[PDB]
Amino acid sequence: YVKLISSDGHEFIVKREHALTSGTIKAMLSGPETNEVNFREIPSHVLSKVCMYFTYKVRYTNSSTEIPEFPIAPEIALELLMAANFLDC
Amino acid sequence: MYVKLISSDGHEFIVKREHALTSGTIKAMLSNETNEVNFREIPSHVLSKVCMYFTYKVRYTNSSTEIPEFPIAPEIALELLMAANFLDC
Amino acid sequence: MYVKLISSDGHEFIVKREHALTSGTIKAMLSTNEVNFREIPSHVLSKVCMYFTYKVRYTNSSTEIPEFPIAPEIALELLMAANFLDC
Amino acid sequence: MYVKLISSDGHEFIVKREHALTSGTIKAMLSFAENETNEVNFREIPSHVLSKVCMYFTYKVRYTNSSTEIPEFPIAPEIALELLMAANFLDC
Amino acid sequence: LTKQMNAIIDTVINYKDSSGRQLSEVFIQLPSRKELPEYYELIRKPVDFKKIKERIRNHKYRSLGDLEKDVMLLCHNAQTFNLEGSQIYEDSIVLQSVFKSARQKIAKE
Amino acid sequence: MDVFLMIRRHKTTIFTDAKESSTVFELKRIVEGILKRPPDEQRLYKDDQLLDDGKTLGECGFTSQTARPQAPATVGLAFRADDTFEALCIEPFSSPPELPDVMK
Amino acid sequence: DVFLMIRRHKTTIFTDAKESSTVFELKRIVEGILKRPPDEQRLYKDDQLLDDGKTLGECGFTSQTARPQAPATVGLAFRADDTFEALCIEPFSSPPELPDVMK
Amino acid sequence: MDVFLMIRRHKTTIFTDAKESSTVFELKRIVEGILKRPPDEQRLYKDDQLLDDGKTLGECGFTSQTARPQAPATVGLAFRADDTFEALCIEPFSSPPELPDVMK
Amino acid sequence: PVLRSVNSREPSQVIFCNRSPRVVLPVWLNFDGEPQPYPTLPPGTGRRIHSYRGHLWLFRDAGTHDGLLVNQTELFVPSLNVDGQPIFANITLPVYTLKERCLQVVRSLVKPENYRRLDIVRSLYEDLEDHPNVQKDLERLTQERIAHQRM
Amino acid sequence: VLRSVNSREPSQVIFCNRSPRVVLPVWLNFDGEPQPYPTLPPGTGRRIHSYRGHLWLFRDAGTHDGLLVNQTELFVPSLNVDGQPIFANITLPVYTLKERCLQVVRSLVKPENYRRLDIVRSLYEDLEDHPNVQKDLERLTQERIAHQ
Amino acid sequence: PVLRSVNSREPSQVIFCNRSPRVVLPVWLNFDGEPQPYPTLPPGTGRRIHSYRGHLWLFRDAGTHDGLLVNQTELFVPSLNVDGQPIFANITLPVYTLKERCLQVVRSLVKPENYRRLDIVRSLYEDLEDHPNVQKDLERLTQERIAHQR
Ligand SMILES: Cc1ncsc1-c1ccc([C@H](C)NC(=O)[C@@H]2C[C@@H](O)CN2C(=O)[C@@H](c2cc(O[C@@H](C)CN3CC[C@@H](N4CCN5c6cc(-c7ccccc7O)nnc6NC[C@H]5C4)C3)no2)C(C)C)cc1
């Protein structure tokens, strides 16, 4: 597991492999391994959803049946796009 | 184009001719040709559902898309089975 | 030795001590060769013993075990007795 | 596709071809080498024997390569000797 | 350097876990496409542990950071292809952890 | 996308399909074709709410997954008697017998 | 899972069929072999006629009494015009008296 | 099937999956593995209702269609202090800014 | 054996996609053409499976042994794979006759030993007792292949 | 911890059902997720193609009741010696009288009617707690962490 | 032209099954490897279509021109039908990158003239402006196909 910490200071414990979906996190962890990474400019309502994507990507990559749309509400769209860009994904 | 099926209790069901013909027994009774047929031993809660099947069969026969289960409630199952066999649906 | 289980209707059941001990609740009560069950009738306590016979005999038997039969008529009262006994 | 085995006393036994082939002697007799023969005639095998010889074909075919448990193929004393004779002749 | 590359790469291969089993036994040589076509379609850069010693015998790797970049690539290629919690998945997680401790002992001591 | 309907007035029940995009008026015309009564003598209800001739069945609430062929959505029908429309009255279908003991 | 000897006169057919399969399906198998259509064949279990609609199971044939080594006997009769041929299964050759060696 | 979860106590949020068929107890064991506190010191809640260690996530209400990977179902966590358990307290995530007029 | 797999030694990657509401039993016909049960597909799942070119498959309701469809037909035989791309087997409900469908429901509600107790005609009782069956259906499918290869 | 191991070495096996029940063979996949396989009727046996190190488990297809294979709960085929097949003998365990009674009651009474039986509340919960591969897998893990 | 249909003259019946939420634009590559737009599949719809063996197809969101997948891959080429049994093309959403997915949503909510009003990096603004495109993607697929593997 790995600990991602939002600006407001929420802690998110997610599987290491799930997190590594983010090239930028891969860099921060792979370059001195530690367990924590701190995002001073990403709020919780965003970093929460960024994790939810890791869950989604990990689960539905290489899925034979059918894949469901990864939903993004208008209210969060812009800040998520920012966060998404800053992280590789 | 339309045909009238009349239940024992005396409900009238107006359904497309071709939808009704899905029933050999009805095909026989209609094959000039009449507009009404009366079922003295089939109640409405049954003949209603028999029509719903015509709707279903006509629509989903030859469909490339996944077909959905034609539902039958326990309470209706036996009388429907009886009606079904008489009709040849 | 042997041990005496007595049903509500007052039937006596003499079964080997080790057979009876298969029941945690009997194990507790004998820890004395008698125990009285005011709420267990004979047709039930009789079958409870038959289980002891079965369990003792077939536990650690390699080739094949036969299903321990329970008739519908007795099923509920046996389930009750079973839970009380811990067998 | 089936085959007809005919006993001395002239009973006809129709059994699957593959069932019959379990007998080397029969396989030999069946396999003019342009096409297949349905009948084979056993001059010296009575019915009560040839009947049981078939029952063996049924048994052998069914239980060969069956995994958990095979039952013993019963032979009554009354038939044992004549069957042994027939058995050896047939090669089954 | 080539000797250290041989040490780092040979320590990761020779490495046995605490039940005595060698982990690299599957990672030694890749499967033929004829054998397993799904792996090749899924994996961009099929590389194994011989393909890496071959490079090292050719000294294709320049620094110890270029040898590491392609040991992480196969160990990550394995993780992508395999099921999470598979035998092969968690050993490519250990082979990355035994390569990162093997390079840290040879390159600075 | 298609919607499957039961248009029911009293003891009459009409089974027909129509597009989500088709209109309440077009439906009145289908009824006219069958029951020989013009769209100006008809009122069509979804449950207890009146449907405006100009709205699409879609906008009224009839959809792909509430108007399936085997679960047709019910449109109520009322005819005009001189000055006033009759009450919307849909005489219910016959009740099924209590479950035989084997299925209970 | 049921093993059968279907016998009419001096002819005996050795064959299997499912407990769940029907007397009619059996007539069809006979049709396939002896080239005689299903409706003129009459099949007996002992001395009782079998209805085309009943499963071999419900006629009385079970896996435990119709084993491959001890096949159950279904009697067969054909139809000539209006009349029914009598259930005639001419018995097999008889075994010699038990030799004194085996007593 | 698979159920996707956020187990949250205070400002801690654990992202993990389990099976519909798996139990509230094994979920406590996953938490034990991370937060280093045994299942007898943990209370797990679905909304405000306490979850029995013996029930399957399925039976608790976590279906595949309410515990999707991108919409994880939230299990609340409480730890034991001596004789009493702390209140279930899940500090909320940061609020998003009022919807910009550009997106209206 | 009209309906049977053909030994090919050329692999064909396939995707079994269960788009029925039922648990699906994939049934591979072997070279002799004997049905071989394979692991079940839960409703709404899809799995990549290794089969060979010319191999013949069939699908059924693992519980009831009811007939299903694959790519709106009864048998599936993987095409030769092109460019590594996997072939797709879309498994769905057919449009059952109202009768057969009713039988299914009655069969699902009443224990088989009680079919006898239902106040219906014996013919219906026979139909109830005639459980659907891969082999019966295979026999029918053969005669339906010799009927479009007669003409 | 409890999962098959990708092996590449075939191990032919004989599943022999010597229980009175229809048996559901359950193969643990590499990730260790139970995979239902085709059922064995009572008193049947089949040769099945499996691989070395593959972990199997057997159960009553109808009730999901626990069965035993070679007097234990898990079966893992050893490497074949000289091509001869390994044998998996599937049998009833000796169920507790309680668990056995539950089995019978569960089989006679619809789950919505467990509430109508004049029994203790605890028993209602026990009745409702139907046996389950996953619950049992969790238990088997803790029984292997307790042997370490 | 590496990526192109092949003149077969052997018909191949196919079933286009749209299991994406999106309206699907089927795109047939011509023999000169030129994308050719075809009639749209509504969401959750399936149609039997007449195509030929070796013909190469590609699918996309008719609106956004976003990339979709057919049978877990980017390109669909019908095999020759066995026994008249139709081939099946199962069209699905791919796992979009969170970024690309976000772009999709922002693009769908904000008028292109207002991309300038978002307090984001200029590079992100260019990414917002850079609508997805069949031709760009075809060029990429060729270099990935000219590499014998991927
Ligand atoms: C009728 C009836 N009744 C009651 S039950 C039943 C019944 C039972 C069974 C069946 C069917 C026919 N049988 C089964 O279901 C059986 C049962 C159970 O035992 C599992 N199984 C299966 O079929 C699984 C299965 C098959 C398989 O075969 C491998 C050896 C093939 N694999 C590719 C070759 C090697 N792999 C080679 C690359 N290797 C990898 C290497 C790397 C790698 C290495 C170096 C550097 C980088 C790398 O990435 N990475 N990944 C690799 N992955 C594969 C690994 C090994 C093995 N194995 O399992 C199937 C179902 C999943 C029918 C009826």
Ligand SMILES: Cc1ncsc1-c1ccc([C@H](C)NC(=O)[C@@H]2C[C@@H](O)CN2C(=O)[C@@H](c2cc(O[C@@H](C)CN3CC[C@@H](N4CCN5c6cc(-c7ccccc7O)nnc6NC[C@H]5C4)C3)no2)C(C)C)cc1
């Ligand atoms: C409702 C709905 N919803 C969602 S989608 C949809 C839908 C889907 C499909 C359809 C309709 C019914 N179907 C289609 O549109 C299908 C689909 C797709 O598969 C292509 N196609 C077509 O119809 C093309 C088509 C192709 C072709 O094959 C030839 C036999 C037809 N013609 C004879 C002869 C040939 N030419 C071949 C070169 N040839 C020359 C070659 C050369 C040459 C070649 C190599 C090297 C050197 C050379 O010099 N030189 N000169 C040539 N001159 C002659 C030329 C002849 C073409 N049949 O149809 C059509 C569109 C092109 C509807 C709805």
